[PDB]
Design a protein around this nucleic acid. Sequence first.
DNA 1: GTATTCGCTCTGCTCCTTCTCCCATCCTCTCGATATGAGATCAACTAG
Length: 48
Amino acid sequence: NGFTGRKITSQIFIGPTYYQRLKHMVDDKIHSRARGPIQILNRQPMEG
DNA sequence: GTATTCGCTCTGCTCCTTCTCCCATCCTCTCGATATGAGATCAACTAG
């Protein structure tokens, strides 16, 4: 255990595995709104 | 004078045809397409 240095009772399965970083980053997805722009036809919040 | 039909109508019954409707939610991104003045009328001035 990294926090206490005690051995973990279960022996953990560990080794090299090929991982991929995918295009989907949270910083390109996070979004918030509070009284922003509105659509012309119906005066409702925009899309996107 | 009643059989007996019998023509004609009145639904009504299946069926085929038409037609109209519907087909999860939410989110991100990219990419392509999408005239000008003259004359007349009228109304406000803008003064005489």
